[PDB]
Design a protein around this ligand. Structure first.
Ligand SMILES: *CC(=O)NCC1CCN(C(=O)C2(Nc3ccc(Cl)cc3)CCCC2)CC1
Ligand SMILES: *CC(=O)NCC1CCN(C(=O)C2(Nc3ccc(Cl)cc3)CCCC2)CC1
Ligand SMILES: [Mg+2]
Ligand SMILES: [Mg+2]
Ligand SMILES: [Mg+2]
Ligand SMILES: [Mg+2]
Ligand SMILES: [Mg+2]
Ligand SMILES: [Mg+2]
Lengths: 5, 236, 236, 5
């Protein structure tokens, strides 16, 4: 799963 | 609502306490109350709002993924079909997630976005609007995955347009927006090339602007740049 | 209650799903529903009940400690007094914790304990009763810390008496009971010598009975014995 | 803080 902020 | 009788300053103070106590549901309720006072939010207060709901919805998304996985596995050949319970419970969590998303979108539409005059505030809220439509998109199937996806895209796009006009390439809000819109492209819009292109251009333009920054601004910007790099590493 | 219309087997199944999803509030609600069907619980089902409420109350206790700490610090000399908010919010969390404890104690009193004929079931429930009075004791101050403490002590004592008569020294329920009653003595009853004595005697009597165990029973028993040793290390 | 189960 990719990083988000 | 239930927070109507509490002072705005008390709601903010309690949101901070709730964060320290890792009580994110409470933190979100306090910040909902604060927003509903009808005054614009400061930068710190916007951060409290976003942290609270990100944690609440994050938990829901994690639970939904576990449940959806179990449900998928229970519906395949060569094992066993064992009743409506997994679907029912995935649906319950899904509905609760949708409810939180609708609440956040409700706050943004009434009336945070329209009252947000400055680039920093307006981009932050439009990014949030993109994010919460993205979470709705993650669980959408029926007559509406497409319209939900477009709503996410439209919010992110408006945010992007403002960010490129009004903020330097290292601005953490601009960076975080681009990070998330890139994920939107990869995971939601089936546009991996757009995702990779956006992450790379954002990273490279930020790199070239780092020289203008203080040590503290540098730390903030490079943290998010590392996330862009992490995603690119995952995708390439 | 709200679970009255759901099948017992469906509640148990959903409790298991909720555990996998780390949705402990849901897990506790499902297990409350299951208990309220009025049938005795199996060993697996007792474990689900205890895991659910331990996680819920554990979160509350952790939050309460953070808040109480902040509150204590805000009430001392040589800094600043900054309003009723920290006390209010600690009180809110405290009340919610008390509510969960009362719910669990309610289930045990109506009617899990009285219907528990076997040693394994009755000791498990009396241990729980001790535990949830202990959590109430942790936050108690007024006309009632003493009566609450005694209620914890009485439940633990009855459990201990049965356990010593009916279970071998390595039985995990007997071990876990002793571990927790030892903590009760140290942290609640201001009886550190009783705490240390109980932990040591329990450990030593278990050690001497390990030879009777299978590899799997050995693993279960030694896990809890290590906790006894950990506590003794902390206290001596 | 001491261990409990
Ligand atoms: C009010 C305001 O300007 N908020 C932005 C601020 C920038 C620094 N920062 C971060 O870098 C993290 N979080 C976010 C959250 C939203 C956006 Cl758009 C960007 C960055 C903190 C940990 C991850 C990155 C906090 C928020
Ligand atoms: C139905 C039943 O017999 N339950 C007890 C069973 C024993 C093994 N076990 C454990 O060792 C842990 N948890 C507990 C919980 C309560 C008691 Cl009284 C003892 C032990 C599992 C992780 C910590 C120890 C699970 C429950
Ligand atoms: Mg006011
Ligand atoms: Mg649905
Ligand atoms: Mg473009
Ligand atoms: Mg039935
Ligand atoms: Mg109180
Ligand atoms: Mg004794």
């Amino acid at each position: 799963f990719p990083a988000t902020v | 609502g239930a927070m109507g009788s509490m002072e705005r300053a008390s709601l903010i103070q309690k949101a901070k306490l709730a964060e320290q106590a890792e009580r994110y549901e409470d933190m979100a309720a306090f910040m909902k109350g604060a927003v509903e006072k009808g005054e614009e939010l400061s930068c710190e207060e916007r951060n409290l709002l976003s942290v609270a709901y990100k944690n609440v919805v994050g938990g829901q998304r994690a639970a939904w993924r576990v449940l959806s996985s179990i449900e998928q596995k229970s519906n395949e050949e060569g094992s066993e079909e064992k009743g409506p319970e997994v679907r029912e419970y995935r649906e319950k969590v899904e509905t609760e997630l949708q409810g939180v998303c609708d609440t956040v979108l409700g706050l943004l539409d009434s009336h945070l976005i329209k009252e947000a005059g400055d680039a920093e505030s307006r981009v932050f809220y439009l990014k949030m609007k993109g994010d919460y439509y993205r979470y709705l998109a993650e669980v959408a199937t029926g007559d509406d995955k497409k319209r939900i996806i477009d709503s996410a895209r439209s919010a992110y796009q408006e945010a992007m347009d403002i960010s490129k006009k009004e903020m330097p390439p290292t601005n953490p809000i601009r960076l975080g927006l681009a990070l998330n819109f890139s994920v939107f492209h990869y995971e939601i819009a089936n546009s991996p090339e757009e995702a990779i292109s956006l992450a790379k251009t954002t990273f490279d333009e930020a790199m070239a602007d780092l020289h203008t920054l203080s040590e503290d601004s540098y730390k903030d910007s490079t943290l998010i740049m590392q996330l862009l790099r992490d995603n690119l590493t995952l995708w390439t």
